[PDB]
Amino acid sequence: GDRINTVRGPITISEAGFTLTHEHICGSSAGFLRAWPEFFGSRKALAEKAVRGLRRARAAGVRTIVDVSTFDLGRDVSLLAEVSRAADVHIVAATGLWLDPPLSMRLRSVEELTQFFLREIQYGIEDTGIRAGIIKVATTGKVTPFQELVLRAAARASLATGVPVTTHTAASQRGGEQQAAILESEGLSPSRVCIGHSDATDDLSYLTALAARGYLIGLDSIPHSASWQTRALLIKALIDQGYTKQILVSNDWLFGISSYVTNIMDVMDSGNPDGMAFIPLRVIPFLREKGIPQETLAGITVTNPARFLSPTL
Amino acid sequence: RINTVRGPITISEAGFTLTHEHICGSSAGFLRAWPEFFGSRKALAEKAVRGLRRARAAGVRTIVDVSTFDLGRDVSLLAEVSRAADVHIVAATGLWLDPPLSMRLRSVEELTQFFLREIQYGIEDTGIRAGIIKVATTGKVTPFQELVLRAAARASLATGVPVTTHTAASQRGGEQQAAILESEGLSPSRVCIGHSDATDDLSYLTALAARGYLIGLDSIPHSASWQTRALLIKALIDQGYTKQILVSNDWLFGISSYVTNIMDVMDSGNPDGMAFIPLRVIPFLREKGIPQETLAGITVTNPARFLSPTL
Ligand SMILES: C[As](C)(=O)[O-]
Ligand SMILES: C[As](C)(=O)[O-]
Ligand SMILES: [Zn+2]
Ligand SMILES: [Zn+2]
Ligand SMILES: [Zn+2]
Numbered sequence A: 001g002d003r004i005n006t007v008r009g010p011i012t013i014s015e016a017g018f019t020l021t022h023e024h025i026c027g028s029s030a031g032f033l034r035a036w037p038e039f040f041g042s043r044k045a046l047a048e049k050a051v052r053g054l055r056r057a058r059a060a061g062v063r064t065i066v067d068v069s070t071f072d073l074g075r076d077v078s079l080l081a082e083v084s085r086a087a088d089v090h091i092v093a094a095t096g097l098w099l100d101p102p103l104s105m106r107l108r109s110v111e112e113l114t115q116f117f118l119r120e121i122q123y124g125i126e127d128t129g130i131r132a133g134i135i136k137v138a139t140t141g142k143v144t145p146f147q148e149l150v151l152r153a154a155a156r157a158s159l160a161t162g163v164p165v166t167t168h169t170a171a172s173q174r175g176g177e178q179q180a181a182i183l184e185s186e187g188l189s190p191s192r193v194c195i196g197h198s199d200a201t202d203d204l205s206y207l208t209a210l211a212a213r214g215y216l217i218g219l220d221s222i223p224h225s226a227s228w229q230t231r232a233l234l235i236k237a238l239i240d241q242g243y244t245k246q247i248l249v250s251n252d253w254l255f256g257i258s259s260y261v262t263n264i265m266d267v268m269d270s271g272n273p274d275g276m277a278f279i280p281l282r283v284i285p286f287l288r289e290k291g292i293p294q295e296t297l298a299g300i301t302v303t304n305p306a307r308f309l310s311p312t313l
Numbered sequence B: 001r002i003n004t005v006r007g008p009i010t011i012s013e014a015g016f017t018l019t020h021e022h023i024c025g026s027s028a029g030f031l032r033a034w035p036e037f038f039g040s041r042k043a044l045a046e047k048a049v050r051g052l053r054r055a056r057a058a059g060v061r062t063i064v065d066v067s068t069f070d071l072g073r074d075v076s077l078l079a080e081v082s083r084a085a086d087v088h089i090v091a092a093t094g095l096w097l098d099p100p101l102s103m104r105l106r107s108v109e110e111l112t113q114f115f116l117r118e119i120q121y122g123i124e125d126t127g128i129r130a131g132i133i134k135v136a137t138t139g140k141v142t143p144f145q146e147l148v149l150r151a152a153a154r155a156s157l158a159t160g161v162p163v164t165t166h167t168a169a170s171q172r173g174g175e176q177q178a179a180i181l182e183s184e185g186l187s188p189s190r191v192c193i194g195h196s197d198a199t200d201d202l203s204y205l206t207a208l209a210a211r212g213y214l215i216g217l218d219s220i221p222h223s224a225s226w227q228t229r230a231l232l233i234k235a236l237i238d239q240g241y242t243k244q245i246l247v248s249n250d251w252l253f254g255i256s257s258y259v260t261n262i263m264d265v266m267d268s269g270n271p272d273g274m275a276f277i278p279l280r281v282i283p284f285l286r287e288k289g290i291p292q293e294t295l296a297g298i299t300v301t302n303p304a305r306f307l308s309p310t311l
């Protein structure tokens, strides 16, 4: 009712504060970080870079991030816990499945996947006792039969535990509509779902209609455009349509990445030196200078994630 | 000296060695994330220890676990079951058929570094070093599979550690593998072409053997006619290529990389497990006139010569 699971344990809704709802410490693959830490220089080097990054973000106001790295994205909650403590920033961990499931996941039934998700939420991830506070799902534009199983399992897990669902989409294909239909067929409330990567489109009609059904709209990759201004104005556009309370904002940034061709991390960093501090240091002043009240911005960056993450129903 | 999950052993300690086996056929990260799939980690461990003791009591002294990173290799489990069962286990590097994005997008130079790491330094943070390099291909060999082939050759050439392959024998896939590996300067004597018992094309096997490749007749119980597959062993013996033969079960004690409950299907079909080769195939070969010295050469001498790091 009033508590969410983080990598350091349970915390009250009040303690969450300014929350970036879609971020990554490391974008990788299952087992990869521990098998090949050298790829990131070293595990310590990666940990240190994250801590410095998170500390700057904290200096700029951020108090909580939701790491939406799944099993198949190389989620290492021990790394999350280590960097969360050193930086003193809350990190919410995720279960669910992204776009790279191995055979041992691809060949599972919806009932089996439901059990895996429940495990990571109710018991803990691996042997850590760290519990997931959100369920991530990724689909291609047209939802594949396996991705539909993952969607349904996520809905059933969410209905059993109250933790929310966040999605990866192709907004240019308007992927969120196919997902929503499947999720609702399972009896899941739109208020428990964030349709992610929605800032990668100019289709306001698509965005508003989803918001009007109660869905959280993930405008979560603003600096990837580094234009980034156009993405930010979608936040304004949705406010002006009256859907302030359905907006979630993030950077979708990373401190390490192996699930892409080599050297991309340095290109990203030089493209966006602010890292996860891009939202508080760049997007928020931009929105102020456009006439959005400070109180509406606080509602979006604090109150909305609070409402979204609190286990419900 | 051969690297095992318990440390280095001399080639004489190896003894009766099964050169293609698995403790568990899974996926990277899977065993630690979802141990309940196998009942529990403890349940999986205990089954494997019983099975390895069964094989030990049948003469086996060493198995080669050719589970790679993407087959969900957990060398801490291997070390645990090896100690409990007093059976040597050789661990593998390389890549099987389910590489994740973080592997699929790597260059050959990068893959070479990863394989070298697991051979020279250790696997994960355990200090356990790989003693063999596994590689799997399909069809005519995909572009990425070529990269793994070449990275494996380069790792082998720098360390002396052998290369063992997964192949579609029905497609004569060993020929393309051989071509690529030889282009890298790798000697065929450092290479086992595996799953070669899944064909009837004897001339395919003979031609590879004649070039110096080890022939992995490693899936005999996966037929159980297994008697027909066993006759391939005698066929190569009769052609004077006893030196080129490796035999194994390719068995597992837990499987997650397939449909649920496939493990139970497999166990009821082959209740002997990894003891299938010594309890069924070896006596069957004696009946057909194969002398004990020849059988000892296949099960002891050949794997020792294969696994011993050689330049
Ligand atoms: C690293 As992503 C696919 O969540 O933008
Ligand atoms: C794990 As297999 C069937 O390729 O030996
Ligand atoms: Zn995404
Ligand atoms: Zn992301
Ligand atoms: Zn194989």
Ligand SMILES: [Zn+2]
Binding pocket: B020, B021, B022, B066, B250
């Ligand atoms: Zn195998």
